[PDB]
Design a protein around this ligand. Structure first.
Ligand SMILES: [Ca+2]
Length: 1113
């Protein structure tokens, strides 16, 4: 069987514009030249995100009615460039006329007829303003670069928007406004129009009041306009309009195109405008959200609760002894970003895995999005989650339940419980609880949905599935066959998947008594519209399940007879315990809260890190799939080195070196690590150092110099294919080091900035910046890396090792010679020649508002490159200029913003949204601050810094932080500033905590893996070396008497901390009162810890496994 693909049946065309609509008149794709104007495509059940609303005001009520789309119940006629909606709302007759002109200009002409005392209209339009590929790839990211300017025109507010991130080399533009009626209020973001409360009510919050008339630059670009209120006694007519320009290189300064708009407004189509049939939903009600639970209910279902978060006495979230995190309904209605989770199948932790199965889900009834096997972009069964507020609620697997006469879609539950193995939703119904579970199977490529009525009451259900079978919905036909209760789905020939994973298929085991259809069952006349919405109707059951299987290589296995969550939960618990070497902090008295938070979060961060590594995608950042070259070298390698997964790291490193690029001999920015030959051959200037640093760290930890002799291929730049001309890794390293020599600025060993550094928003805006900038951070990283490489290679290739020592010395010399003035390391040097040099991000740059950069200050400490006196100064600088209650910031003032055009840095000057790196508290960099503090032995600061970015009970620790999902990593902390100008003007509020801050994108980051390393390796001080253990704690008095359980060289040991500032020596380690012999570690800033031989350590542990660590902090 072949499932057809959805094509929008209403197609309007004019000149260079094609605007398509679904049969109810919902926007599908609005394209002008090569720019997509809407942000979200409509779907056949929800409609689209845009609308026009008529509101009617009475003495005892306010009412609101959509005039367009499938929910208006409007009749429709179309022409070649015109669409006419007709209907009535209460006693008012309306017609809406959509006109697409030849001028990249459209109109919504509204005519109202009847009698009423007071009414208004609200125009509502979600906007993308990018290429189709950019919009579909990440609407959130696109919106961050869409800068809005607000003006007063002839008819009140007009909204002009410029896309600041280049789209096919163009900077596209929109203008929206009203004609013939005043727009007296406006808004620009979805969170302002729909509100968080939508996630429960399904009603846009703005419809009960007046728009705020503020421009919020966030991630849901969404234009709304509210008309003046009016009376009707007869017929009244007015319009909204839009203008799209594909290229607007200047910044916006005023309302433009006034003459074109006037001409366009006179345009009408000559053709006949004829009726079309509108399929209508039948017995489908509004969505169903659970009622909230009270205290007794919560206590009954969750009698054992830890780390409880309460606001105004309402419980918002908590953790359980079974290592779950539970979120109550009220918390979702306060968090701007939706609570969610990623499930992933276990794999063999000695090798880089392939074919890992993953699924995503969210609290508001998205039970299974983006089901994948291996590649998270291409090897996909179910569509990706999009947006934030679940206005479009079709993606993946969704559930309708019949309540009264109507099927109603499940949305927001009373509670949502997450475990590394699965998610559970609790919906309170009238005298029953429906429990929905979505969970991963252990040792099998499967995700399981289970539905169960707690009272064993029967219901009717429809479970919908937005299939892709390939990278995207609505792109290609799908093969579907059935044998009994088993469905098999596989891609048709044109799909890219089909080419590199020709045996890829999925299977679903469905319930015995169900019926299968597409969306036809939702409609009064049974018309199929979307043929790839796979709908399963299940009648009168009190429970059922759906089991999903993924096979990238065709290794089809039978279904089990029984699918039990509890057994998977126990097996995943053990798997994660082993991953973190049975980490557990304990004390005889009450454990300190910081230890309690670590015990609660560590497996969550291990799960996040494991996803980042093996199935790369996030909640917001659903498009990943590849390894970032610098990223795999950080989060995953640091996590695995910390925990002793050395075989895994070796394989990672071999894989990584095989992706080095022939001819250039640097690495791509990112690459697929599976059979898809896809990479980004253009890279930042820091990227080349990471694989060099990582191999060195591995060699130092393990002694495994054999890796250097492995024969490994390269990849071609344009094609990403193997060259089949392998060389030893040692020679890979030599070629990479040659590229580094070639970066020297003439007469120096200063490394040119080239494509940029760690901060992806700081790409140079022109070629001269590319050649003549030097990043002090890059310079420092280069010194660190070449020294590590020197040591790693010393016993293998004497000469190469000597040359690395000299290069490192030269680089170190240039760092001290050029990049430091008045004791302050400059962020950058701009050098045309010895005669023409200037600092940036240094106090000497008196023309700039930016005088200090974090990165060089931490990197120079971590590398032990900064001498003691300089390092001390770096810390004073951080404290005075960079330290905030929500963490340390990246620079002491924001980057330039002047309407979206770049002068020095690219994305930093283009982002209209205060978020991500632009927030200046990008949590990954704060984690490196912690690594620097640990290097200096500064325990009080280091532990305080660890807690400032720990999501558990964050709002109690950082009083100006807004609450966020407590069991997942957050990537950034951003002040609640509506735009870049207010951010620059009141930046100092961040220092003092006089503005609230909120969390950024979730889960997918190097952050979790590196945080884990800070905890274990740098603070608790347990590190592994070649046949040695290093014990080097940086702990506060609070850890006195606390014990760590940790598995070392396969043996579980217990490390008890005694913190004694009066001791003679810096550290002493005892077991059964015997002092362990060892040698002192090297550290230029403080007394180092101790290195103990593996055999001595293990021999001691066999006798008595409780090691006592006496340390003077
Ligand atoms: Ca104590």
């Amino acid at each position: 069987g072949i499932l057809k693909t959805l094509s929008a049946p209403i197609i309007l065309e004019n000149s260079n514009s094609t605007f398509t609509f679904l049969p109810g008149g919902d926007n599908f794709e609005w394209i002008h030249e090569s720019i997509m104007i809407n942000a979200f495509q409509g779907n056949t059940l929800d409609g689209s995100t845009n609308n026009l609303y008529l509101r009617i005001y009475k003495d005892n009520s306010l009412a609101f009615y959509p005039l367009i789309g499938m929910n208006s119940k409007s009749t429709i006629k179309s022409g070649t460039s015109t669409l006419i909606f007709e209907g009535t709302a209460e006693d008012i007759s309306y017609t809406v006329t959509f006109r697409l002109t030849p001028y990249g200009i459209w109109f919504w002409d509204i005519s109202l007829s009847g009698n009423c005392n007071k009414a208004d209209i609200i125009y509502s339009q979600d906007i993308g303003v990018g290429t189709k590929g950019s919009v579909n790839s990440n609407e959130l990211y696109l919106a961050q670069y869409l800068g809005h300017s607000i003006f007063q025109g002839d008819y009140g507010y007009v909204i002009c928007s410029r896309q600041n991130m280049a789209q096919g080399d163009l900077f596209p533009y929109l203008q929206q406004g009203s004609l013939g009626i005043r727009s007296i209020a406006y808004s620009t973001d979805g969170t302002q129009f729909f509100g968080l409360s939508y996630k429960k009510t399904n009603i846009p919050e703005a419809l009960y009041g007046d728009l705020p008339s503020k421009n919020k630059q966030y991630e849901l670009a969404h234009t709304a306009l509210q008309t003046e209120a009016f009376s009707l006694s007869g017929t009244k007519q007015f319009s909204f309009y839009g203008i799209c320009k594909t290229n607007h290189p200047e910044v916006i300064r005023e309302i433009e195109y006034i003459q074109e708009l006037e001409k366009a407004y006179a345009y009408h189509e000559s053709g006949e405008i004829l009726p079309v049939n509108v399929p209508t939903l039948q017995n489908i009600g509004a969505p169903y959200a659970s009622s909230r639970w009270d205290a007794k209910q919560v206590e009954h279902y969750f009698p054992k609760r830890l780390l409880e978060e309460k606001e105004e006495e309402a419980l918002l979230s908590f953790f359980t002894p079974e290592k779950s995190h539970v979120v109550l309904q009220d918390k979702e209605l306060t968090t701007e970003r939706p609570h969610g989770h990623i499930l992933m199948t276990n794999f063999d932790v000695t090798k880089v895995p392939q074919g890992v199965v993953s699924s995503t889900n969210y609290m508001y009834g998205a039970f299974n999005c983006q089901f994948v096997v291996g590649n998270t972009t291409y090897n996909k069964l179910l569509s990706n989650h999009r947006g934030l507020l679940n206005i479009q609620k079709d993606s993946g697997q969704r559930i309708f339940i019949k309540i009264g006469d109507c099927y109603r879609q499940l949305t927001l539950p009373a509670a949502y419980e997450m475990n590394v193995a699965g998610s559970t939703w609790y919906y309170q119904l009238d005298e029953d609880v429906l429990i929905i579970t979505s969970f991963a199977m252990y040792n099998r490529p499967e995700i399981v949905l289970k539905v169960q009525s707690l009272g064993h009451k029967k219901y009717d259900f429809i479970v919908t599935h937005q299939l892709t079978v390939g990278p995207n919905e609505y792109e290609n036909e799908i093969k579907l066959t059935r044998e009994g209760n088993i469905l098999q789905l596989s891609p048709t020939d044109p799909v890219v998947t089909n080419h590199f994973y020709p045996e890829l298929s999925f299977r679903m085991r469905i319930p015995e008594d169900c019926t299968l259809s597409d969306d036809s069952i939702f409609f009064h006349n049974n018309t199929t519209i979307n043929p790839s919405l796979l709908s399963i109707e299940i009648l009168q059951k009190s429970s059922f399940d759906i089991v999903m299987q993924g096979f990238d290589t065709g290794n089809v296995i039978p279904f089990l007879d029984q699918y039990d969550y509890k057994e998977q939960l126990e097996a995943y618990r053990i798997y994660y315990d082993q991953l973190v070497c049975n980490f557990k902090l304990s004390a005889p008295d009450k454990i300190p809260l910081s230890a309690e938070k670590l015990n609660a979060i560590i497996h969550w961060y291990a799960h996040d890190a494991l996803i980042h590594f093996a199935s790369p995608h996030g909640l917001e950042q659903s498009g990943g799939a590849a390894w970032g070259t610098r990223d795999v070298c950080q989060g995953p390698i640091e996590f695995f080195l910390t925990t002793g997964h050395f075989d895994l790291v070796r394989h990672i490193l071999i894989t990584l070196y095989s992706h080095q690029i022939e001819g250039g001999f640097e690495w791509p920015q990112w690459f697929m690590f599976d059979h898809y030959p896809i990479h980004q051959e253009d890279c930042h200037g820091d990227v080349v150092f990471w694989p060099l640093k990582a191999i060195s760290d591995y060699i130092q930890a393990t002694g495994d110099t054999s890796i250097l002799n492995e024969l490994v291929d390269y990849r071609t730049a344009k094609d990403a294919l193997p060259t089949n001309q392998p060389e030893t890794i040692l020679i890979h390293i030599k070629r990479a080091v040659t590229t580094i020599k070639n970066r020297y600025l003439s007469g120096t060993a200063l490394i040119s900035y080239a494509g940029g550094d760690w901060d992806d928003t700081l790409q140079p805006a022109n070629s001269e910046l590319k050649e003549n900038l030097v990043s002090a951070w890059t310079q420092a990283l280069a010194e660190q890396t070449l020294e590590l490489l020197c040591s790693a290679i010393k016993g293998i290739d004497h000469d190469f090792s000597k040359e690395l020592s000299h290069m490192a010395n030269d680089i170190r010399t240039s760092f001290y010679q050029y990049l430091i003035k008045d004791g302050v390391i400059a962020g950058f040097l701009y050098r045309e020649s010895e005669e023409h040099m200037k600092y940036m991000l240094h106090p000497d740059d008196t023309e700039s508002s930016i005088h200090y950069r974090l990165l060089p200050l931490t990197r120079s400490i971590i590398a032990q490159l900064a001498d003691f006196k300089l390092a001390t100064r770096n810390l004073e600088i951080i404290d005075e200029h960079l330290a905030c209650p929500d963490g340390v910031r990246l620079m002491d003032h924001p980057a330039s913003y002047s309407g979206g055009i770049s002068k020095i840095f690219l994305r930093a000057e283009q982002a209209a949204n205060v978020g991500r790196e632009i927030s200046l508290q990008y949590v990954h960099a704060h984690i490196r601050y912690i690594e620097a503090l640990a290097t200096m032995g500064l325990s009080k600061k280091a532990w305080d810094a660890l807690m400032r970015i720990n999501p558990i009970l964050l709002t109690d620790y950082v009083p100006n932080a807004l609450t966020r999902q407590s069991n997942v990593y957050f990537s950034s902390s951003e002040g609640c500033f509506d735009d870049r100008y207010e951010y620059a003007k009141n930046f100092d509020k961040l220092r003092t905590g006089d503005i609230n801050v909120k969390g950024g994108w979730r889960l997918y980051s190097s952050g979790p893996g590196i945080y884990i390393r800070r905890i274990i390796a740098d603070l608790l001080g347990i590190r592994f070396g070649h046949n040695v253990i290093h014990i080097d704690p940086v702990v506060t008095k609070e850890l006195d008497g606390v014990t760590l359980q940790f598995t070392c060289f396969g043996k579980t040991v217990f490390f008890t901390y005694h913190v004694d500032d009066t001791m003679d020596k810096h550290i002493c380690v005892k077991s059964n009162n015997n002092i362990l012999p060892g040698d002192n570690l090297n550290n230029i800033y403080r007394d180092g810890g101790i290195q103990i031989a593996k055999d001595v350590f293990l021999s001691a542990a066999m006798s008595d496994n409780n090691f006592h660590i006496y340390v003077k902090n």
